[PDB]
From Swiss-Prot, chain A:
The chain holds residues 22 to 58 of 478 of the full protein. This is Somatomedin-B. The gene is VTN. Disulfide bonds join C3-C7, C3-C19, C7-C37, C17-C19, C17-C30, C23-C29, C30-C37. Residues 1-37 form the SMB domain. It comes from Homo sapiens (Human). It comes from the Eukaryota.
From Swiss-Prot, chain B:
Its main location: secreted. Forms a heterodimer with TMPRSS7. Interacts with VTN. Binds LRP1B; binding is followed by internalization and degradation. Interacts with PPP1CB. In complex with PLAU/uPA, interacts with PLAUR/uPAR. Interacts with SORL1 and LRP1, either alone or in complex with PLAU; these interactions are abolished in the presence of LRPAP1/RAP. The ternary complex composed of PLAUR-PLAU-PAI1 also interacts with SORL1. Interacts with PLAT/tPA. Also interacts with SORL1, when complexed to PLAT/tPA. It comes from Homo sapiens. Keywords: Glycoprotein, Protease inhibitor, Secreted, Serine protease inhibitor, Signal. Gene3D superfamilies: Alpha-1-antitrypsin, domain 1, Antithrombin, subunit I, domain 2. Glycans are attached at N204, N260, N324. The keyword Lipid metabolism does not apply. This is Plasminogen activator inhibitor 1. GO terms for cellular component: collagen-containing extracellular matrix; extracellular exosome; extracellular region; extracellular space; peptidase inhibitor complex; plasma membrane; platelet alpha granule lumen; serine protease inhibitor complex. GO terms for molecular function: protease binding; serine-type endopeptidase inhibitor activity; signaling receptor binding. GO terms for biological process: angiogenesis; cellular response to lipopolysaccharide; defense response to Gram-negative bacterium; dentinogenesis; fibrinolysis; negative regulation of blood coagulation; negative regulation of cell adhesion mediated by integrin; negative regulation of cell migration. Serine protease inhibitor. Inhibits TMPRSS7. Is a primary inhibitor of tissue-type plasminogen activator (PLAT) and urokinase-type plasminogen activator (PLAU). As PLAT inhibitor, it is required for fibrinolysis down-regulation and is responsible for the controlled degradation of blood clots. As PLAU inhibitor, it is involved in the regulation of cell adhesion and spreading. Acts as a regulator of cell migration, independently of its role as protease inhibitor. It is required for stimulation of keratinocyte migration during cutaneous injury repair.
């Protein structure tokens, strides 16, 4: 549920929350997306 | 660097294809911009699709020093010197739920310091809102509504966008009070009235010949701190079409335009212009040999995804350029150089020789 070291991996259907550059448009960003990525 | 020159050469060749199909229309374009996004696309491609891009660009992004030198150029353009004068964005959008090759993104990130964006094209209106809003917010609100309704559909899987805005601040601005309406002679033999700026200054003003022995003049207009320059280029004789100059005005020539041994005072009269061009890159890229990337089954993007078939549904550049008295929201006999017929302009990044912008002004 964290974005730590995941900011560079793109969309991941298996993960519970996302870290890709468009995740905000999908309301799916992990809560620490901003501070990590 | 070699890659800055190769990237400008490629982008100028693309500009030439665009200008050729433009008729009597104004065009603004970015050679740097199309080189940068096509260089990134090289990473996604394989087989003949990759070969065609690499052959047309004249280098492989994977080769030693190629990517670092492009990153360096990009970083530089974002420097403190750029007073929101250039706002650019390159983006590749792929179908969001398409399985990508293991390790492709970190590898893409290592080379370019961005990623390939992942948007769900099956929700048509939403994807178009997303792409449009992305472009808008990354060009400081200057390029909005890139894609109108029906620009993409449910079967769209891969889209390339490059969007740029330019409004440079002159080293010496044109006094506002010197601006007034003057006659401008169009290539069809008709004459229109247009606002033209005027200043007395010491500019580089050099005469050259084309192979067919037509005389042309190159005027250099530096922006603040000499980082960028606008060059204005035109045949000396009115009867000579602008195309006699476009077809020969290569990256090599431009990067070699240099100072006058002794600069001389002259009164310069130049039209104001505000141009916006949307270029569909497909035909220009196919004319340069890049046909496979557009072909549904032939396209090879197996470096991006080896799960499902992929091809480029759309490849777009949209450029907006503003040329006025200062490039700000502010409010301000020797030989005369009067630009009152169609001309080419080039915006050059001086430390690298990079051709950032290029265009023809057929009617201000």
């Amino acid at each position: 549920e964290s974005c730590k070291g995941r900011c560079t991996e793109g969309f991941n259907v298996d993960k519970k929350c996302q870290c890709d550059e468009l995740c905000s448009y999908y309301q799916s960003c992990c809560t620490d997306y901003t501070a990590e990525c | 660097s070699y890659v800055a020159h190769l990237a400008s050469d490629f982008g100028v060749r693309v500009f030439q294809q665009v200008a050729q199909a433009s008729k009597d229309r104004n065009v603004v374009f970015s050679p740097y911009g199309v080189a940068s996004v096509l260089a990134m696309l090289q990473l996604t491609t394989g087989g003949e699709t990759q070969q065609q891009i690499q052959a047309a660009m004249g280098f492989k992004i994977d080769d030693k020093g190629m990517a670092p030198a492009l990153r360096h150029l990009y970083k530089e353009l974002m420097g403190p010197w750029n007073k929101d004068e250039i706002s650019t964005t390159d983006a590749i959008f792929v179908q969001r739920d398409l399985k990508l090759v293991q390790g492709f993104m970190p590898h893409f990130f290592r080379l370019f310091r961005s990623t390939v964006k992942q948007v769900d094209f099956s929700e048509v209106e939403r994807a178009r809102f997303i792409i449009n809003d992305w472009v808008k917010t990354h060009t400081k609100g200057m390029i909005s509504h890139l894609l109108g309704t029906g620009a993409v559909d449910q079967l769209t899987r891969l889209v390339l966008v490059n969007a740029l805005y330019f409004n440079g601040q002159w080293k010496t601005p044109f006094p506002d009070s010197s601006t007034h309406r003057r006659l401008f002679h169009k290539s069809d033999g008709s004459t229109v009235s247009v606002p033209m700026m005027a200043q007395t200054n010491k500019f580089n003003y050099t005469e050259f010949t084309t192979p067919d022995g037509h005389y042309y003049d190159i005027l250099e207009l530096p922006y603040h701190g000499d980082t960028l320059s606008m060059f204005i280029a035109a045949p000396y004789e009115k009867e000579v079409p602008l195309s006699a100059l476009t077809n020969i005005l290569s990256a090599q020539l431009i990067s070699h335009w240099k100072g006058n041994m002794t600069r001389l005072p002259r009164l310069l009269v130049l039209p104001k212009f505000s141009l916006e061009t949307e270029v569909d890159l497909r035909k220009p890229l196919e004319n340069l040999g890049m046909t496979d990337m557009f072909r549904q089954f032939q396209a090879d993007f197996t470096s991006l995804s080896d799960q499902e078939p992929l091809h480029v549904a759309l490849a777009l550049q949209k450029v907006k350029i503003e040329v006025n008295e200062s490039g700000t929201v502010a409010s301000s006999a020797p030989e005369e150089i009067i630009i009152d017929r169609p001309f080419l302009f080039v915006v050059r990044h001086n430390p690298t020789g990079t051709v950032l912008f290029m265009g023809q002004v057929m009617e201000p």
